[PDB]
Amino acid sequence: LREELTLESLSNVKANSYSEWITQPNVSRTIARELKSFLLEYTDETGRSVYGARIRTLGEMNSESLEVNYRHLAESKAILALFLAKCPEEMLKIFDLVAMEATELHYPDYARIHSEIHVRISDFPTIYSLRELRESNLSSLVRVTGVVTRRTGVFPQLKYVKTVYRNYQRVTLQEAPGTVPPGRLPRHREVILLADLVDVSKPGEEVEVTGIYKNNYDGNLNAKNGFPVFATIIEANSIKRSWTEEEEREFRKISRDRGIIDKIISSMAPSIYGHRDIKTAVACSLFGGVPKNVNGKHSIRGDINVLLLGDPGTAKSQILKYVEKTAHRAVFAALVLADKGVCLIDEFDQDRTSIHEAMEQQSISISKAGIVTTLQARCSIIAAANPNGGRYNSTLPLAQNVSLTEPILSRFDILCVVRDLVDEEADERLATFVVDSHVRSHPELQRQRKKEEEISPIPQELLMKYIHYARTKIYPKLHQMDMDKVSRVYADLRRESISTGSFPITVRHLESILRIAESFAKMRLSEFVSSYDLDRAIKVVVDSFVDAQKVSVRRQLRRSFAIYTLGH
Amino acid sequence: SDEINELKEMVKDEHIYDKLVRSIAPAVFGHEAVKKGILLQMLGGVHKSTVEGIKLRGDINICVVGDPSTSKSQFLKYVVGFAPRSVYTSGKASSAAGLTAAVVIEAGALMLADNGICCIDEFDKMDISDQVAIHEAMEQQTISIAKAGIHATLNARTSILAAANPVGGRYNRKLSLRGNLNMTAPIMSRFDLFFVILDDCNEKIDTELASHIVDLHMKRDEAIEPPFSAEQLRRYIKYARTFKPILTKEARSYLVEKYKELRKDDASYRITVRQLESMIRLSEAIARANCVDEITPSFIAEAYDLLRQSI
Amino acid sequence: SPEQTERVFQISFFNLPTVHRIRDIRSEKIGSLLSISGTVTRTSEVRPELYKASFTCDMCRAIVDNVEQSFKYTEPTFCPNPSCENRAFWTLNVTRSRFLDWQKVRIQENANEIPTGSMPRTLDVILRGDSVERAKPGDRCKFTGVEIVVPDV
DNA sequence: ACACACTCTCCAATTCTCTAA
DNA sequence: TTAGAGAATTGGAGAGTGTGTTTTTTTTTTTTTTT
Ligand SMILES: Nc1ncnc2c1ncn2[C@@H]1O[C@H](COP(=O)(O)OP(=O)(O)NP(=O)(O)O)[C@@H](O)[C@H]1O
Ligand SMILES: [Mg+2]
Ligand SMILES: [Zn+2]
């Protein structure tokens, strides 16, 4: 009762098992005193007691979970770490009851905010996949990794058996495909999430879990297998998966330099040679414009949509894979998952019908059995296609080379055609670059730095951070001076289109020009569009419009349009 | 120790490459080109990836086209009877579910052939609805399942060996291979090598071929007399696959010249950048066959010469 | 350290005189020592099997130990303390009880051995201890052990 | 309401013991 | 040494009580509308 053990007295487990030793009153009181003495006293090398600084922020966020690193608990009072690894279900009860004392020392009457606090363990120093688990692991703490395959809804559950409840949710976890050995199927396990941990993860995420490994009787398993076979589950204890002023100043430094637009385009898709216009269009789509709306009868999207007609093997699928790794959020082939992101299509009636609705709208609506509901698309579409068989025909307009309705070609902001042209010098350049890249990739720090800086003019980590910063912070606008010239150019282009008997230029093209100019302003972190932005946007759209036409019309257009496609 | 001694003895030989080619499929008369292709597929290239995280395919796909009685199925029968990881499947009597994977989840043929050779016989009889499944798997070396609330992704690092019939049963020398073969252009674009077999009637060949066939029916084991034992050859192939050779400087200079020659011949299936990548794979396999850690330019001359027989 | 439980040794045999086919399993050989061969077609995940059990009474502080299971989950017949008669509300002490690793696998006849006009038969095999996850689907294997008979639990 | 599983209770069949002829 | 009168222990007859029951493929032959 009154007397307490020394820490050295705990070195000898005196009962027949660990659990029956931890649960004794004098041992338990000793452990409680020692844990409280650790939590009030552990330090950085700089002093600066970390847990006194964490409890402080627990109340600043009105939170419920205190987080403890295992390495700190192993760095002093090692026996408590050993007992925690062996008997988590007991040790964590004592530790939670100590954590409440420590928090009330900062914030008296915190019990009125939350009645009970949970300790979360981090950095447990050994890991298993779902292969290595065996019966010896039962009731031990484990650390596991995988992909979350399926998730239930959240429900309340009765806490005690006057009443009290807690939140509950189950998650199915599967081995990551990179970990699975060759020629074997992946394994599965199911995880239980309680009060603070529900909806911490989403289906398809790759996730890391710490918790107790636990089992129970199940009648159906016994009945079907015909042997006394128990079922097992994991009870999670913790689950795992911005910028400074220095980054902002660095971004602004590079943006202040001349030619930053060209350098960003050059950094785009380093492994692919040539095809600068495709890289330009992809960069413009990833940065995008600004959305606008006028409740008097009109709305304008900020997203930029691009379509690429590809000869066989002209790098299309590689740049889509590159964009998939570059972009913040994306879908590859579902438009709900592409919300405020980029959507990627590499090959191609109901699918096309869905895309017809998606290009007309920015939000999707559906009804079924009298139910009615709505969803958001709000995304930029990058698509590629094979031109109606083995090879494109340049003598014909674009419609002859595609399996698309006319409004699709109207509503795509940018159209482009890529062809396997014949040139000895280009072939030699391609072949030299290809074998050079092949050698540079061979499995057989300084080597990496040289390789990286030869690969690109911008480090791509900085470029991804820069794209995210620009997308979240920069919102450009037009300047009202040169817009008279834009209107005159629009009228001139329409007059020339009619004069040669071309299909006419339209308001959609003018809108696309303004949107692309906004994107060009965003690329250099400029809140103003400028004359050169309008010039570049005009060149892109005019050249794209010219590429869609028949050959005789193409010659008349380029002869007249020389003062836009090349001059300004 | 005796295994190591025997392996060292055959490794030391000057004429090892020729004997290895000669020891594939002992019962089939002639057709050394296909046998060489089978050996290089069996050894394989070197798998690798770039700084960008994109992967570069390290293995070889082969297709054999021929009019009837050309013994083309004997190559598939030998391969599935020899290679440690392999499966044999007929294009008529199989389903997309049975080829990739099926809900019951249980593994299909391409899953069992992971890190192995998968044999498709009478490919031209397969339904388009299932050819596209093989195409999607071959594009990614990956298989995907999503149905009934169950989702899964699986790895399929499998090399394909296929056999097919020309349309109308006999090949037309007036026409491209695309005209002769009932196969869609994206799938055709993904075979590293195509072999076309033709009767080419000739008394001096017939008089020998008939003798060879009658000897097989007259004596069971005695006729073939191969250069090596099968259990010897498998140990050699296991040993060879441990090498990871590196491309020499002179070979890099030589490759672009040979590729320019192919492009000028092209200026028939149109020659793309993929042919250069395939040629690199074949050169890696050739160097590995010889137990050499450097790609000598002679190996690329061999690979270029072998590849142009498919055109 | 606290007390350490006993090691569950396993005896194993090999190089038996002859190998039978799945088609040669017949009820006269039940409980004898045999060896078999075939191709694997399915495998189960590893599960814990209850080997020896220990229970404690709800109505009084009493404990029962080393209860033996065989094919179905089995519990005590009396309260050992004669001051109590309750037979209900036992709980299995997971710390004091002992488990084993258990895996189910499924095999079918070798294709080259099938007789004329017939089709391949199949069989279910049990693996325990240090031999779980050794087998792989699509591979060819040789097994040895004893054939048994399982009830309708 | 209709076969079952399980619990409770009373009554007489049985064997054991003591006494005297 | 037999036997008969009285006491104690056990078995199971049978009476009673509570209970449970009805009731997304994947593969293969055939008809039908659709390009
Ligand atoms: N700079 C390059 N230019 C062209 N091709 C390249 C280049 N670098 C690599 N390649 C290869 O050429 C192909 C690039 O085009 P890609 O579209 O990805 O091939 P593909 O998907 O098989 N053709 P397709 O099926 O019609 O899309 C790949 O096989 C690449 O490995
Ligand atoms: Mg592609
Ligand atoms: Zn009791």
Cβ–Cβ contacts within 10 Å for residue A532, how many? 13
Cβ–Cβ contacts within 10 Å for residue B231, how many? 8
Which nucleotide's C1' atom has the smallest distance to the CA of B96?
E26
Answer yes or no: do A229 and A256 share one domain.
no
β-partners of residue C95 are none
Single out the residue of A275, A269, A306, A278 nearest to residue A515, CA to CA: A306
CA distance A229 to C49: 4
User: Which of B88, B105, B112, B158 should be substituted to probe chain C, the one whose Cβ sees the most C Cβ atoms within 10 Å?
Assistant: B112
Instruction: Check: CB of residue A433 under 8 Å from CB of residue A425.
Output: no
Q: Pairing state of beta strands C33-43 and C98-108?
A: antiparallel
Answer yes or no: do C109 and C96 share one domain.
no
β-partners of residue A157 are A166
Instruction: Check: CB of residue A410 under 8 Å from CB of residue A507.
Output: no
Answer yes or no: do C112 and C43 share one domain.
yes
CA distance A309 to A414: 11
Answer yes or no: do A147 and A116 share one domain.
no
Provide CATH code, domain B1-311: 3.40.50.300
Instruction: Check: CB of residue A51 under 8 Å from CB of residue A106.
Output: no
Q: Could you tell me how many helices (H) and strands (E) chain A has, helices first?
A: 20, 17
Å from C68 (CA) to D5 (C1')?
26
CA distance A128 to A132: 6
Which amino acid is located at B227 in the chain?
P
Cβ–Cβ contacts within 10 Å for residue A356, how many? 15
C-chain residues near A226 (CB < 8 A): 71, 150-151, 153
Say how many CA atoms lie within 13 Å of A173 toward its Cβ: 24
A312 pocket-lining for ligand 1 (C-beta < 6 Å): yes
Answer yes or no: do A198 and A311 share one domain.
no
Q: Which residue has the tokens 């779980």?
A: C132
Instruction: Check: CB of residue C43 under 8 Å from CB of residue C24.
Output: no
Residue A297, sorted as left (phi over 0), alpha (psi -120 to 50) or beta, turns out to be left
Give the closest-approach CA distance of B180 to chain C in angstroms.
Answer: 36
3-state secondary structure B33-59: HHHHHHHHHHHCCCCEECCCCCEECCC
Q: Interior CA angle at B261 toward B31 and B17, to 5°? A: 35
| Domain's final residue, options A126, A144, A178 | A126
In what side-by-side order are the strands of the sheet with B117-121? B86-90, B117-121, B159-164, B62-66, B193-197
Answer yes or no: do A219 and A309 share one domain.
no
Give the torsion sign (CA, A512, A518, A519, A521): positive
Single out the residue of C62, C54, C129 nearest to residue C94, CA to CA: C54
Who surrounds ion ligand 2 at CB < 5 A?
A 316-317
Q: At what angle do helices A25-39 and A78-86 cross, to 10 degrees?
A: 120
CA distance B115 to A562: 57
In a domain, A280, yes or no: yes
CA distance C94 to C74: 15
Task: Check whether residue B98 has its CB closer than 7 Å to nucleic acid strand E.
Answer: yes
Answer yes or no: do A558 and A509 share one domain.
yes
CA distance A119 to A112: 19
Task: Check whether residue B107 has its CB closer than 7 Å to nucleic acid strand E.
Answer: no
In a domain, A479, yes or no: yes
CATH number reported for the structural domain that contains residue A101 in this entry: 3.30.1640.10
Question: Which class for A44: exposed (0-12), middle (13-18), buried (19 or more C-beta within 10 A)?
Answer: exposed
Q: At what angle do helices A507-523 and A531-547 cross, to 10 degrees?
A: 130
Answer yes or no: do C142 and C70 share one domain.
no
Token readout for A387 is 């031109």
Instruction: Check: CB of residue A232 under 8 Å from CB of residue A213.
Output: yes
Å from C52 (CA) to E20 (C1')?
34
Answer yes or no: do A180 and A254 share one domain.
no
Task: Produce one character per residue of C118-130: b if its CB has 16 or more CB atoms within 10 Å, e if not.
Answer: eebeebebebeee
Question: Chains contacting A with at least 3 CB pairs below 8 Å?
Answer: B, C
Answer yes or no: do C67 and C28 share one domain.
no
Q: What is the DSSP letter of A128?
A: B
Name the closest ligand to CA A420. Answer: 1
Single out the residue of B307, B296, B300, B299 nearest to residue B265, CA to CA: B307
Q: What is the DSSP letter of A336?
A: G
Tell me, yes or no, if C136 comes closer than 8 A to chain B by beta carbon.
Answer: no
CA distance A234 to B37: 51
Instruction: Check: CB of residue A15 under 8 Å from CB of residue A21.
Output: yes
Single out the residue of A256, A290, A306, A259 nearest to residue A544, CA to CA: A306
In a domain, A20, yes or no: no
In a domain, A172, yes or no: yes
Single out the residue of B157, B158, B176, B155 nearest to residue B166, CA to CA: B176
Single out the residue of A460, A483, A485, A451 nearest to residue A563, CA to CA: A485
Answer yes or no: do A182 and A88 share one domain.
no
Instruction: Check: CB of residue A67 under 8 Å from CB of residue A120.
Output: yes
β-partners of residue A306 are A382, A414
Structural domain count of chain A = 3
Distance B138 CA to ligand 2 centre (A): 13
Break chain B into its structural domains and give their ranges.
1-311
β-partners of residue C98 are C52
Instruction: Check: CB of residue A291 under 8 Å from CB of residue A300.
Output: yes
Answer yes or no: do A335 and A462 share one domain.
yes
Residues constituting chain C: 153
Q: Which residue has the tokens 């834009």?
A: A486
Answer yes or no: do A384 and A500 share one domain.
yes
CB contact under 8 A, B112 and C137: yes
The secondary structure element, H or E, covering residue A94 is: helix A88-106
A348 pocket-lining for ligand 1 (C-beta < 6 Å): no
In a domain, A10, yes or no: no
CATH number reported for the structural domain that contains residue A473 in this entry: 3.40.50.300
Task: Check whether residue B249 has its CB closer than 7 Å to nucleic acid strand E.
Answer: no
Answer yes or no: do C96 and C111 share one domain.
no
Answer yes or no: do C61 and C96 share one domain.
yes
Answer yes or no: do A336 and A324 share one domain.
yes
Distance C75 CA to ligand 3 centre (A): 14
- Distance between the two ends of chain A, CA-based, in angstroms? 93
β-partners of residue A367 are A372
The secondary structure element, H or E, covering residue A206 is: strand A206-216
Residues constituting chain A: 568
The secondary structure element, H or E, covering residue A130 is: none
β-partners of residue A295 are none
Instruction: Check: CB of residue A144 under 8 Å from CB of residue A234.
Output: yes
Q: What is the DSSP letter of A220?
A: H
Q: Which residue has the tokens 């033996």?
A: C68
Q: At what angle do helices A483-499 and A507-523 cross, to 10 degrees?
A: 140
SS3 of residue B163 by DSSP = strand
Say how many CA atoms lie within 13 Å of A509 toward its Cβ: 22
Q: Which residue has the tokens 């994206």?
A: B186
Answer yes or no: do C105 and C137 share one domain.
yes
Answer yes or no: do C29 and C60 share one domain.
no
Q: What is the DSSP letter of A376?
A: E
CA distance B34 to B16: 18
Out of A149, A183, A203, whose CB is closest to B112? A183
Say how many CA atoms lie within 13 Å of A437 toward its Cβ: 22
A153 pocket-lining for ligand 1 (C-beta < 6 Å): no
CA distance B275 to B300: 13
Range of the domain at C32: 19-47+101-152
For residue A557, what are the contacts with CB-CB under 8 A and spacing of at least 6? Answer: A496, A497, A500, A502, A546, A549
Q: Pairing state of beta strands A330-332 and A342-345?
A: parallel
Give the resolution value in Å.
3.5
C-chain residues near A17 (CB < 8 A): 2-3, 95
CA distance B50 to A271: 8
Distances (CA, A) of A502 to A200, A405, A420, A493: 56, 18, 27, 11
For residue A300, what are the contacts with CB-CB under 8 A and spacing of at least 6? Answer: A291, A292, A293, A511, A515
Answer yes or no: do C78 and C116 share one domain.
no
Range of the domain at A285: 242-564
SS3 of residue B160 by DSSP = strand
Give the torsion sign (CA, A79, A85, A88, A92): positive
Which nucleotide's C1' atom has the smallest distance to the CA of B149?
E24
Q: A353-358, long-range: CB within 8 Å, 24+ apart, which pairs?
A: A355/A381, A355/A408, A356/A405, A356/A407, A356/A408
Instruction: Check: CB of residue A414 under 8 Å from CB of residue A306.
Output: yes
Answer yes or no: do A233 and A103 share one domain.
no
Q: Which residue has the tokens 């705990």?
A: A10
The secondary structure element, H or E, covering residue A139 is: none
Q: Give the helix ranges, DSSP H, for chain B.
A: 2-11, 16-22, 32-43, 72-82, 96-99, 109-112, 128-140, 177-180, 185-188, 203-218, 230-240, 249-266, 274-289, 297-308
Out of B85, B107, B115, whose CB is closest to A185? B107
Instruction: Check: CB of residue B245 under 8 Å from CB of residue B288.
Output: yes
Torsion of CA B144, B149, B150, B151, to 10 degrees: 40
SS3 of residue C20 by DSSP = strand
Which amino acid is located at B310 in the chain?
S
Answer yes or no: do A113 and A132 share one domain.
no
